[PDB]
Amino acid sequence: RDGRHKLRLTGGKKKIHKKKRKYELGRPPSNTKLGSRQVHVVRGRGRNYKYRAIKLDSGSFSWPTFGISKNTRIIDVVYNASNNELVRTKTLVKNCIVVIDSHPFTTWYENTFGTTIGKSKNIDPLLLEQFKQGRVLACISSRPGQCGKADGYIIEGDELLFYKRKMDKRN
Amino acid sequence: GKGIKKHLKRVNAPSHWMLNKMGGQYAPKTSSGPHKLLESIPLVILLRNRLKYALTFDEVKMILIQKIVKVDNKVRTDCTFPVGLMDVIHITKSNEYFRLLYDIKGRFVPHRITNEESKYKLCKVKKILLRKGRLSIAVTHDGRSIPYIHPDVKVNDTVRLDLETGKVLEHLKFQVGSLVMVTAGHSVGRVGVISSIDKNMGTYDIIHVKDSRNKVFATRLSNVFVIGDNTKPYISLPREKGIKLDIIEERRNRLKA
Amino acid sequence: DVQHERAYQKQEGASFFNSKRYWKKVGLGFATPKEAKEGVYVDKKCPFTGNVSIRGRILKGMVISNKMKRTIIIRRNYLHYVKKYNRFEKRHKNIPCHCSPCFDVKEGDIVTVGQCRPLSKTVRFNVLHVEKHQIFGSARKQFVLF
RNA sequence: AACCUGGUUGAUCUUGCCAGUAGUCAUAUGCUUGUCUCAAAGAUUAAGCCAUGCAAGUGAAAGUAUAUAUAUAUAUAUGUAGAAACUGCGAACGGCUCAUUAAAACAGUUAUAGUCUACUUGACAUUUAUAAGGAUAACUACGGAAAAGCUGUAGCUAAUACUUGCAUUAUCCUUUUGGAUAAGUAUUUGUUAGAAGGAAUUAUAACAAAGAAGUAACACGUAAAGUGUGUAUCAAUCGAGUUUCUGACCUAUCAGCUUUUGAUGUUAGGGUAUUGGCCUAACAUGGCUAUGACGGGUAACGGGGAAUUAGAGUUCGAUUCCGGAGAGGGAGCCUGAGAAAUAGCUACCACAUCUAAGGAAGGCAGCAGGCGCGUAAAUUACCCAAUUCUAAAGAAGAGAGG
RNA sequence: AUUUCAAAGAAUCAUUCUUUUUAAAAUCCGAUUUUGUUACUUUGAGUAAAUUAGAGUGUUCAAAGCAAACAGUUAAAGCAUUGUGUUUGAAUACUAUAGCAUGGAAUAACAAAAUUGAACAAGCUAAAAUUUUUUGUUCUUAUUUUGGCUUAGUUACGAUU
RNA sequence: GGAAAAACCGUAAAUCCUAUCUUUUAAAGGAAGGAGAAGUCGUAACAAGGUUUCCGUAGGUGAACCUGCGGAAGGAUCAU
RNA sequence: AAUAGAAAAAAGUAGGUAAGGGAAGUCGGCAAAAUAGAUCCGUAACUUCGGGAAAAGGAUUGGCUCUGAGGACAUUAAUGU
């Protein structure tokens, strides 16, 4: 649990008195999964309410190229840059790489240009590959265990290339 | 547990309470809000220990249940309400108005104010904040919010403030020639015209202060309350006007009654 | 330059759809080094390009160890007054400091560190200025006016 | 008040001790005590044990009364009280002890741009309506248990308990007019723009998405138009958590410690009220050490201070204030803004009470008083008049306090 | 050991304290005002009361305490134009040995340190800015100015015993 | 919507087996130190104390001690 | 293998197995049983300092589905086989 009882700056074993106080925590990990949404409200100090996501499914995913976000179903959890546990169990955190359906974005692009606000340098080939299979890699941008949501951004360009390579062929 | 310590003991009280060693074991602890506890006096001390209009705290309670007493020209419902660094007590039945100031001895005195100056007070801003909709708000020493405050007013400026409508009348810009009153320094409870205002990056700020007797002394910028212009004090300062007397002068005067 | 870590290099507040790096004033008469202004470097514990607050006390010390990843140990040397004999004695104290990718600090360099935001268990301070200095005596034994 | 005598010898000067001598808000004790003022008083020894009693409750303009009482006008109308009970709020303080603790706790000094904040104070809100939805206590009855602050049915019925839910402002065109267009406070994400601060990834402004919660279905009453209670966000305030620097008694017959069990760093997350190895994974191989680390001792809570002080000092600091620690031993929760509470709860161990022999309940280091320990320490007194505290805050409570 | 000695005046009691001025560099209207760091020291700021020193104050004195005092047989007086007591007092300082600001000419430390360094004038050159310049989301070229870099000269040029 | 009951991590009291350290405390016998009485035995030291003293050291010895080796005078010689 | 068959008790011999206690057994724990492999921890008195030592005393160990570590070649640091 929280606070005092860890080793001294000298490396010494510090003797402890002053018993554990209420303001000293150690509280359970989030373990939000892939499945029809479930969240439990948690009561923090001062009656500050937090949301502990146990299942998730549709987050709000942001299309970097036009800087816009829409609420969208997540197809799967696919890669984790840390441990092997999270990705195998399909349990998702703000590090995690998920896959989203591209239809909101595909629709928006159709609305703007007329085939698949205002002009930019438009779609990238890596983004185009993800859109083409209908199923798009995205990075979660919010903390499900604190906020109840796993809202995200479609993973882009150099970050996409690096992780795509890192994810792979060997697999 | 280890929560909010409610009571206040006798010599736990600030110095200028003057609640002596005899005659009690406790002091009153102020209600929250208008000014800081350490920068306040309650009504009990003023009515009983200063004015001497009550024998006991119970006689103060008897005064307070009756609705003739007003602070900020508004009725207040408890003895432990704080009268701050500066504010106005109005006693309806006697028709008396007092404004609270620090004395040269470093303790709070209620100084008699008349009807004409009673309708306003002069209020130092502690903060000026920008709130949503591009809307300014000032925050005063006496705990008032002023929305729509004039944008060239700044965070150490004082402001003349109506007490019925709550509107600001004028403002007094903090400068090197400003008449200043010391809140709580070693120079506590005294007034001067400022020799220099001295600003230094990421640290406490100094002001050099020049006396009516044309002597010089230092004071911290944080505890200095702007009070007039080199023309005049804007409010009515006490009858002895913040003047320094030496120890030798005071005893020589003391004998020379 | 080359990548070699398993984390994407965000450098937060950079921005990417506005037309064409991040660093701040740092204040107190101090300023960003040339390697901060023009360098490619990414960190989050760097004072120049991180979100770490350059708050609190600013002291000078002497670097004694330089071999942790972007992290330095500085000794603050002093004379402690003994009232009984009305005399002084030599005393010293070790302060763990973040080093920045800006500064390639070496043994016996003087460093000006700040209090900042506590980073972790031991490490709590950060270098703001490297004043280059040379002493050929071994660092553990060295006394300086810092 | 900056101060000394007697004692080595047959006699002597010297070294050197012993002895006297004075003080001690420092304890015990012997003898003696006509007064008066003043008044420390079960720390040292067992943070050992406790018989009996008592120590926190709260209703006078302002939630709820067909128990009932009552004043006018006449078994009806008004009304006014009201035992009682739901409800609300407090009991997180104050009192007690100093066992544990030796860079922790404590003291000054930062920082919190890493945060939370009830009462109190001031700002002040955004995507069926002449009044909605039931359900529950007291209460009525039958009951059950040796005991206990045990409680079971069924019919009820309220609430400011619980649950629903009823424009307007700004931008563009037009004359202080008429049309058109927009409209979520916290909180979170992605995209930019960028009043203040030494420093901003801050105030703030816009865009695209999500998004709590909400904005009174409540009570009094100002000429011989006023108020209370409730409410989101913001600030203030009463505070609180963390966090910087600097400061320790004795001990080396304690010299190398720390690191698979996070030690030290980096990265990523989770967790938290927030920073943080706080916790998990992955990756580094560090970090601390004669200035005495790491152990061990202390009849060691820390400070303001107390005793003696010519000047240094030396000894001492349970013991009226401030801060910490603890509530039989350990441990864990709940409730709530605030407690890891302790006259809150749960469990284990150490104790232990009533038992109807099934079972059930208990915690004085609160105030008395008792036992045991001892060299050593007072009354189960009376009172809230003052001092203050808590409430629905005058009018009542309080072994706090006197 | 070593690095800026001094001089003259004025005030004042043979004395004492003080002021003026005596190289160089930068800046402002030929005159005007700035110039290592730290220790040390001075002032300060901000700083719990109790205690403590200590003032005021005859508790019956003193230990104490934080009070009191004055006149009136109920008015003289003050101030309101029959109304209304008054003067007051409850100081000052110690309050780490550290941190913060702050004046400092001595004393200490430290700092750069010719097996070569830096002060200027000259010429070439790439960076940024100025001036130029048509067409109501936005577009060519050009002179010039400022800082950075390469190269011949020129300073009282550059090392204590 | 929802009580009991179970299961899983995560806290984690307590019990028991050791392991190490702390503290007193037992124990036959061994081997010490001091105090007391004119006890037994020598005659060791003090004077050249009747073999100069003392040091270091080793060996002997019932001892006090003796002897060797090399020092010093704190020698009974500071003198051809 | 210097024999077969049938029956199946004693007894023998080579084996097993046994409640509750656990050396009370006897010349002596003889016999028998318990221990036991690896990997990870931890390891004393004492010592000729080499040892003691595998001391003592603990823990773990199947099956499956994953993750990481450890090569070889050739295209200018990355990409291939």
GROMACS .gro file of N, CA and C in nm, chain C residues 4-5 10 15 17-18 47 51 59 65 71 74-75 81 96-97 121 134 137 141:
model
   60
  432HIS      N    1   1.583   0.419  -3.094
  432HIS     CA    2   1.644   0.305  -3.030
  432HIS      C    3   1.569   0.261  -2.905
  433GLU      N    4   1.469   0.338  -2.863
  433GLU     CA    5   1.382   0.315  -2.752
  433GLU      C    6   1.247   0.261  -2.800
  438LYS      N    7   0.691   1.192  -2.827
  438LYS     CA    8   0.586   1.291  -2.842
  438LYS      C    9   0.631   1.436  -2.843
  443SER      N   10   0.260   2.041  -3.180
  443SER     CA   11   0.162   2.073  -3.285
  443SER      C   12   0.202   2.029  -3.425
  445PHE      N   13  -0.049   2.048  -3.746
  445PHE     CA   14  -0.135   2.085  -3.858
  445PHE      C   15  -0.128   2.234  -3.886
  446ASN      N   16  -0.086   2.316  -3.788
  446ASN     CA   17  -0.031   2.449  -3.810
  446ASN      C   18   0.095   2.446  -3.900
  475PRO      N   19   1.400   2.054  -1.837
  475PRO     CA   20   1.328   2.171  -1.789
  475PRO      C   21   1.284   2.256  -1.904
  479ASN      N   22   0.731   1.947  -1.911
  479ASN     CA   23   0.627   2.018  -1.837
  479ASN      C   24   0.666   2.036  -1.691
  487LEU      N   25   2.037   2.647  -0.630
  487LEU     CA   26   2.165   2.638  -0.563
  487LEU      C   27   2.270   2.590  -0.661
  493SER      N   28   2.908   1.234  -0.976
  493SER     CA   29   2.877   1.118  -1.057
  493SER      C   30   2.792   1.162  -1.173
  499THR      N   31   2.113   1.180  -1.565
  499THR     CA   32   2.096   1.208  -1.422
  499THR      C   33   2.233   1.220  -1.360
  502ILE      N   34   2.519   1.574  -0.737
  502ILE     CA   35   2.596   1.693  -0.708
  502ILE      C   36   2.623   1.695  -0.560
  503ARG      N   37   2.746   1.727  -0.520
  503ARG     CA   38   2.775   1.753  -0.381
  503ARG      C   39   2.772   1.900  -0.351
  509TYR      N   40   2.904   2.556   1.145
  509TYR     CA   41   2.948   2.626   1.263
  509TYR      C   42   2.921   2.549   1.392
  524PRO      N   43   2.066   1.463  -0.556
  524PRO     CA   44   2.042   1.400  -0.684
  524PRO      C   45   1.967   1.492  -0.779
  525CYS      N   46   2.018   1.507  -0.901
  525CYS     CA   47   1.967   1.602  -0.997
  525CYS      C   48   1.949   1.541  -1.135
  549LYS      N   49   1.159   0.882  -0.618
  549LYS     CA   50   1.207   0.842  -0.488
  549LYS      C   51   1.331   0.915  -0.439
  562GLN      N   52   3.741   2.251  -1.392
  562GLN     CA   53   3.841   2.146  -1.392
  562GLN      C   54   3.908   2.132  -1.258
  565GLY      N   55   4.204   1.641  -0.875
  565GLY     CA   56   4.180   1.557  -0.757
  565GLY      C   57   4.051   1.479  -0.765
  569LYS      N   58   3.680   1.333  -0.274
  569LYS     CA   59   3.759   1.408  -0.180
  569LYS      C   60   3.754   1.559  -0.201
   0.00000   0.00000   0.00000
